[PDB]
Amino acid sequence: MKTFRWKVKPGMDVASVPSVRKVRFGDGYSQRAPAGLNANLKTYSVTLSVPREEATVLESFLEEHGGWKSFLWTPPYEWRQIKVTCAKWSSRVSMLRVEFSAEFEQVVN
Amino acid sequence: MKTFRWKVKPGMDVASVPSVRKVRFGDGYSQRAPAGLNANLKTYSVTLSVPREEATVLESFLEEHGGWKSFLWTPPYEWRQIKVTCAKWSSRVSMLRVEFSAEFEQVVN
Amino acid sequence: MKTFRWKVKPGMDVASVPSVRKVRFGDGYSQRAPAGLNANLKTYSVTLSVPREEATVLESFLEEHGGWKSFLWTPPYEWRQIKVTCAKWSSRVSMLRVEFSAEFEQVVN
Amino acid sequence: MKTFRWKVKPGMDVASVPSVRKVRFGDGYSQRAPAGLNANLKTYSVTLSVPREEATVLESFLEEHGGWKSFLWTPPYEWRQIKVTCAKWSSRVSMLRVEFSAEFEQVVN
Amino acid sequence: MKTFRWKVKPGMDVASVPSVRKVRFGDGYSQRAPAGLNANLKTYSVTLSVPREEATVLESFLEEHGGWKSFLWTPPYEWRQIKVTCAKWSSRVSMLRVEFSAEFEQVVN
Amino acid sequence: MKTFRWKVKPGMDVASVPSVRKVRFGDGYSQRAPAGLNANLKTYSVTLSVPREEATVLESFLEEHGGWKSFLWTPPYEWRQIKVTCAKWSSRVSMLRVEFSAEFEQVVN
Amino acid sequence: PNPTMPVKGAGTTLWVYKGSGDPYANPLSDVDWSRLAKVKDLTPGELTAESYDDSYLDDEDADWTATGQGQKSAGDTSFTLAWMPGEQGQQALLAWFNEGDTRAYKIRFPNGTVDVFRGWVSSIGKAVTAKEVITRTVKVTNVGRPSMAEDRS
Amino acid sequence: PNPTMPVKGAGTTLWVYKGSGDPYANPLSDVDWSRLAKVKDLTPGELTAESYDDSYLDDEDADWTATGQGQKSAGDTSFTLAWMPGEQGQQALLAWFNEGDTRAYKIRFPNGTVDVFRGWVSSIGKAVTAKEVITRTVKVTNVGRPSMAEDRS
Amino acid sequence: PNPTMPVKGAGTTLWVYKGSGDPYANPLSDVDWSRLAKVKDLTPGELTAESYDDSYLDDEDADWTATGQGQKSAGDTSFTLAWMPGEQGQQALLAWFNEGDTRAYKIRFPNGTVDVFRGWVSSIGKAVTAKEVITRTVKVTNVGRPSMAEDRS
Amino acid sequence: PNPTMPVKGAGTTLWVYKGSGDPYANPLSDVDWSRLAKVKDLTPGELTAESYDDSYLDDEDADWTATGQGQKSAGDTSFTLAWMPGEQGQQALLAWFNEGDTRAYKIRFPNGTVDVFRGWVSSIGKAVTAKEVITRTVKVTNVGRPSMAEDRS
Amino acid sequence: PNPTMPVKGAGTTLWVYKGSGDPYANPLSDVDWSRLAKVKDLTPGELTAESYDDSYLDDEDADWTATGQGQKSAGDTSFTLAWMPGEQGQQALLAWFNEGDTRAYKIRFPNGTVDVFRGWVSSIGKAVTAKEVITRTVKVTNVGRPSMAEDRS
Amino acid sequence: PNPTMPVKGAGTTLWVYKGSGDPYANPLSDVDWSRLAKVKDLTPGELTAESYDDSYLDDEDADWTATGQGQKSAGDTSFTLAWMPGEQGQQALLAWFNEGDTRAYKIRFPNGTVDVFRGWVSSIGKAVTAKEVITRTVKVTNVGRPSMAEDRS
């Protein structure tokens, strides 16, 4: 699989929400347990800016993968290679540079 | 097929949402695959600024096609001719200029 | 039918949305066709300010027509007389002037 | 019937939504006609500013009527006496002044 | 019953909405009547700030009553003792002072 | 059980919503009574600022517990040790610092 | 005293109304008017007015913008006078300030003309210097409609 | 009186129109024009214009910005003339201020050219000094299209 | 010592209350008042007020705006005195700043009258110059209601 | 006339293009160029550029901020010249202002170099003084790409 | 060296701590303190404090506003000194700036009193002039609580 | 040439790098460095830094605020040099401006040390005076990490 090479602007938002099974009893007592065997998966939300000439390369890269294939990428947050999929993305075309906004979800596959 | 010869203003927004089939129950094993061939069709959000006299020509061009007929247009983002349709547009008339907002959707046919 | 005489302050918003019948096939192919025989009808949104003494005349004029009778008016956007009807309106009473805000739908009747 | 003698502040908002019967399926032929005799009844959104000592009198006047009883009031908009009812009002207490906000609805009975 | 001692900062919002039984007839005629025997009850919204050391006292006082017991308090609006109950409250802890937000409903019980 | 040693920043928000049983039809006589013993459990909205290097340790501490396991923490609001659970947290990565946002919910077990 | 010829500013005096009635009628009589003495500087307020916009789409000449007069207003009046706490006038000034009220104050000119305003006191200050007289500075915010000297001519 | 040669500002006079007809047609006649007397200062308004953005994506040279002229507008005209409430001109000026109205006023130059504007009165002030003449400061906001001296040549 | 006649500023002294009781009652006695020495400058605060809008629709005269006085407030009091850390007054001043506290301070004038305020300390600064004395600049923010010189007369 | 040596500003002239063609090609010839005469002061525009941010997370040296050049732009050109309404140049200037258009204007220097810009007129003003020549002040907003003298060397 | 009497500013020195321990304890000893030499000007920071509003509804005297002292803060310290890059002190200064850290700096006065702060370096500048010494301008932002000279007396 | 003693500013020269390699390594050699000639003024950029907030609730001393150094940045470098379009240096300057690029420029001092920066050109202006030499004003915005004089000692 191909590797994501381009760099990310400051302001990355990392949102991680685990899934748990909760039962709330009468007087504040409760039961808590993890839902699944595997650990939770984060959802990195990134934004990046590239020149006009290099916008086509990145758009084609995200296009060939569709919303179903996963590519390797090393987030600056922890510096360990992971598998991410970009389901949707948008771009704002300025005069000199193009600004992309996308959400790289993490998948174990 | 008529062509769109007017010039768009900075800030054109390209939103792409690839069509994908995904099945995933809870946090379990997930499978993804594309829905079809022309999965990714982009919708371009454009803005046009034209004088008072030239507003009638643009309005007539957009009204004559309606929401059904498709015209040829070459976006400034990638410079490849595509067929688009404009289903809605709004004008904001000022003292000396008129500002147009519209959404162009790429179509295969 | 009586004619609308008062002038409109800059900032008029002309919103036009055609009606179409769309069928979306498998691989991005589709069918498009107009829904009705007649052309679409615009919805001019206007704002106008008049002195305190003249506010009563405009309010009475809009009141007598209710929301069911239509009056002639030549919008500055295209400069051709049309038939419009005002279903609802509002006003903000300052010290010296009253500012009306209303949405003139267009009807062929 | 008691009368309202206090003075309103700049920025009164008079909202008029006439009651009409319209039938229109899709984009076809449309027919409109009034619903009754007193189709148009306005609601006045007023704002009153009174000192700390005189807030009790206004509050008592609005409270004793409740939402049911109707009092006479001469709007500054058109200078014709009408019968209105105050169904809700909110007070924002300050250090030296009290600010009232209420909606008076014209009624026939 | 215990009495509320701490003072309220300017900006207190007093909202009063009466309860009425309305029926709307054909031509704008109607029937209006009060719903219940008792007069309506206001709902004061207060904001107060106290030092860090005194925050525990106020929090313990509000926690003791839960959301089911009522305490006497004399609002600055009218200066007559009433019975109020606090169903929910919040506090924002700064470096030096804690600012509370709560809504004291009025109950005749 | 593990303990939380990091220091929160100004603006921590403590929300208290006591659990109560109330019955009231319309505006009639109302009865209220507590729901249980541990009726009032607070949720603390904290914000944490840590450098780039120390973000990994805090992230690992929040992750290894998941939404189920509970740890000891001494809030700066009342200075009494309690048991909380962090169900969701979000990070905003900057050039030199990382900002954490999380909600700690008090638990009895 | 010729109103139709330029005059120097020397001789201007300040008066405060202390009676009951209409100050605007016969303001040329000093009865029921007190006086503030030893005024160093006097800056009468400037009458101003705000502007609305009067440009429409239906007009032809859209190249040049247009506007129109809105709601007028009278500015603030400021004067500096010597600090004499034992005098009646300055005690009246402080009673005016503490008891927030709108009272008429008259300005008299070397020519036979007067200017009458109405306003409350918005500021009171002091300036202490080792080699100069202690000064009391006052600013009054006018309210309503003034009575300019041009009305009675 | 040579328009094609520089002149000195001394001798400029200010006029106010008080008739019925077209102010711009034959403004070289003093009939039906009043005169304000003894002007100390005069600052005519500066014609200006706002800029609309003319940058598109389809063009080739994106390195430099582009723009274009929009709605022009005439500025504010202010002058300071001596205080003479007994004169007809200043009474007319106060009546002009009190009645919200737009009237044309002419500025005459030592060379045989005149300048005509159209505007309402936006401010009136006064200045009192111990050793100087009391002055009346007036500010006028122009409305519409002016008629400069270059039009008639 | 004539309150009814102008006086020069030389001789003004600054005092700080260090007792228990009512500062405003009999402030003409120096008992329980410390004295801050060698004050180079002194700028008393200016009493001000804010304006609420008194404009309605029901009135007839809508041409001119209306307003009225609101909450009054006392200003900031600034002085600069020579730097002497060994003196009791400046140690009391630093203790006043470090401990958030509102204390009354008296201003005495050459004529037989005093000015009394109440406020906390908002700023302390220093100025070092090669050929001039080191000075301590202090700014005090008043709180509550002042007691001017006009009250006791 | 040595371009490689410092020169004094005396002798600078201003020209306006009144022909059809490309002004940037052979701007050293005065054919089809008009002249604005008797210029008192000249302030050529300053060429500027805005900055985007070029800092990323992946880079190592995060201590110091980084940036890069963005879209360039040319500033406004202002000059003040004597008021002669009878001359052809100033009438052409007024026609330039009224008919909003972008026309090329050339600046010539004592050394054999020229500077060519393009812009519309953004301001026209006037200053009247009793003892000085009436002055016409003009400001032109440049649009597009300038042609500096360093290009042709 | 009498603390209880005014002194001139000449002789002030600046020191930087380069040891391990508590600078606030015994700051009168120069051991483990470096020195920055040839200081041209020195502007010590001004200690400030913000305000919280303390006005309530339940109180009676609502005419006059009230407030109270909030969280104190120490200002910035700036000094200009001669540029000697070969000296140890200025190299330590640049190392202080590059490695962002809070270090204690002492100020000594002609009388036997010292002033100790803690802060990081917020600015470093330079000024070059043909006929004057090249100067290095520094600004330090204090953090925490200072140790004023009045504490030890 | 004594780095440990103050020096006068006269003799400072400005250089621009026009080679391939590391500008910061051996910047004491003039090979591959062009020279800008006849600099009238020079204002080196001031190194600054931003402050993050370091205040927590768990700490004890809440009376005084705390903070700390953040991400540093180099300032803007401005100079004015005589206008000599025929010289190679100014042609290089215009090519530097038109082509968006970041290149290193060296500042040399009378003492044996240099200052090396890195930045793009942010502004270029001109000044024309009747009796003075035409000057070219340049503003350079620094990017990255500078290499001060204190590093190499």
Numbering used by the authors:
A (entry chain C), B (entry chain E), C (entry chain H), D (entry chain O), E (entry chain D), F (entry chain F): 1 to 109
G (entry chain V), H (entry chain W), I (entry chain U), J (entry chain L), K (entry chain T), L (entry chain R): 4 to 156
Publication passage describing the model:
The temperate phage lambda, which infects the bacterium Escherichia coli, belongs to Siphoviridae. The virion of the lambda phage comprises an icosahedral head and a long flexible tail. The tail, which comprises the tail tube and tail tip, connects with the head through the neck. The neck–tail complex comprises a channel formed by stacked 12-fold and hexameric rings and a 3-fold symmetrical tip.
Our structure revealed that the tip is similar to an inverted cone of 410 Å in length. We resolved all 109 residues of the distal tail protein gpM, which has 2 conformers with minor differences in the E-loop. Six copies of the 2 gpM conformers form a 3-fold gpM ring, which anchors the tail tip to the hexameric tail tube through the β-sandwich domain via electrostatic interactions. The protein gpL contains an N-terminal gpVN-like β-sandwich domain (residues 1–166), which corresponds to the HDI domain of phage T5 pb3. Three copies of the gpL HDI domains and 3 copies of gpJ HDII domains form the last ring of the tail. The E-loops of the 6 gpM molecules exhibit 2 conformations to adapt to the 3-fold symmetry of the last tail ring. In our gpL structure, an additional density feature in the iron-binding domain, which was surrounded by 4 cysteine residues (Cys173, Cys182, Cys205, and Cys212) and could not be assigned to any main chain or side chain, could be modeled as the iron–sulfur cluster. By contrast, in the lambda tail tip, the 3 copies of the 2 FNIIIs from 3 copies of gpJ form a closed cone-like distal end of the tail tube. The density in the tail tip lumen was modeled as a trimer of the gpI (residues 135–223) and a three-helix coiled coil belonging to gpH (residues 818–842). The gpI trimer serves as a plug to prevent the early release of the gpH oligomer and DNA from the tail tube.
